[PDB]
Amino acid sequence: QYGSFCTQLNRALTGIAVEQDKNTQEVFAQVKQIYKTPPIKDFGGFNFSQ
Amino acid sequence: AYSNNSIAIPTNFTISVTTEILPVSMTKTSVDCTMYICGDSTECSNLLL
Amino acid sequence: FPQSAPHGVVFLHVTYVPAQEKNFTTAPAICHDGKAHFPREGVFVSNGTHWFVTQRNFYEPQIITTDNTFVSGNCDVVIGIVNNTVYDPLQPELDSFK
Amino acid sequence: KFNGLTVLPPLLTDEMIAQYTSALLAGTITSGWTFGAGPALQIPFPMQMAYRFNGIGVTQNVLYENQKLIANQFNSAIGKIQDSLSSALGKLQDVV
Ligand SMILES: *[C@@H]1O[C@H](CO)[C@@H](O[C@@H]2O[C@H](CO)[C@@H](O)[C@H](O)[C@H]2NC(C)=O)[C@H](O)[C@H]1NC(C)=O
Ligand SMILES: *[C@@H]1O[C@H](CO)[C@@H](O[C@@H]2O[C@H](CO)[C@@H](O)[C@H](O)[C@H]2NC(C)=O)[C@H](O)[C@H]1NC(C)=O
Ligand SMILES: *[C@@H]1O[C@H](CO)[C@@H](O[C@@H]2O[C@H](CO)[C@@H](O)[C@H](O)[C@H]2NC(C)=O)[C@H](O)[C@H]1NC(C)=O
Ligand SMILES: *[C@@H]1O[C@H](CO)[C@@H](O)[C@H](O)[C@H]1NC(C)=O
Ligand SMILES: *[C@@H]1O[C@H](CO)[C@@H](O)[C@H](O)[C@H]1NC(C)=O
Alpha helices in chain A (DSSP H): 5-28
Which ligand ends up closest to the CA of C84? 3
User: Can you say how many angstroms the Cα of residue D6 is from the centroid of all Cα atoms in its chain?
Assistant: 34
Could you tell me which residues come within 8 angstroms of residue C79 by beta carbon, excluding any fewer than 6 positions away? A44, C28, D64, D67
At D14, phi and psi to the nearest 5? -65, -30
Could you tell me which residues come within 8 angstroms of residue C21 by beta carbon, excluding any fewer than 6 positions away? B8, B9, B10, B11, D39, D41
Burial label, C61 (beta-carbon count in 10 A; 0-12, 13-18, 19+)? middle
Between the two ends of chain A, the Cα-to-Cα distance in Å is: 62
Closest residue to D41, CB basis, from C21, C39, C77: C21
Select from B2, C57, C20, C24 the least CA-distant residue to D26: B2
Ligand 5 pocket member C23 (CB < 6 A): yes
Instruction: Give the integer Cα–Cα distance in Å for B42 and C58.
Output: 79
Please say whether the beta carbons of C42 and C56 come within 8 A. yes
Element (H, E) at C5: strand C2-5
Instruction: Give the integer Cα–Cα distance in Å for A29 and D20.
Output: 7
Query: Between residues 26 and 65 of chain D, which touch chain B (CB distance below 8 Å)?
Result: 30, 39, 41-47
Strand C51-54 to C43-46 pairing? antiparallel
Experimental method for this entry? cryo-EM
Pocket (CB within 6 angstroms of ligand 4): A 40, 42; B 3-4; C 80
Strand C82-83 to C30-31 pairing? parallel
Alpha helices in D31-66 (DSSP H): 45-55, 60-65
Sheet of C37-39: strands edge to edge? C69-71, C37-39, C30-31, C82-83
- Which residue's C-alpha comes closest to atom 14 of ligand 5? C23
Cβ contacts of A37 on chain B, cutoff 8 Å: 2
DSSP assignment of C49-92 equals S-EEEE-SSS------BSTTEEE-S-SSSSTT-EE---B-TTHH
What does this entry list as its resolution, in Å? Answer: 3.7
Instruction: Give the integer Cα–Cα distance in Å for D19 and A2.
Output: 48
Ligand 5 pocket member C96 (CB < 6 A): no
- Say which DSSP state A43 is in: S
- CB pair distance less than 8 Å for A38 and B2: yes
- Say which DSSP state C15 is in: E
Instruction: Give the integer Cα–Cα distance in Å for D59 and D91.
Output: 38
Instruction: Give the integer Cα–Cα distance in Å for D80 and A50.
Output: 11
Please say whether the beta carbons of A32 and D27 come within 8 A. no
Beta strand ranges found along B1-49 (DSSP E): 6-23
Could you tell me which residues come within 8 angstroms of residue C22 by beta carbon, excluding any fewer than 6 positions away? B8, B9, B11, C59
Centre a 10 Å sphere on the Cβ of residue C25 and count the other Cβ atoms it contains: 15
Give me the torsion for CA of D44, D49, D51, D54, rounded to 10°: -160
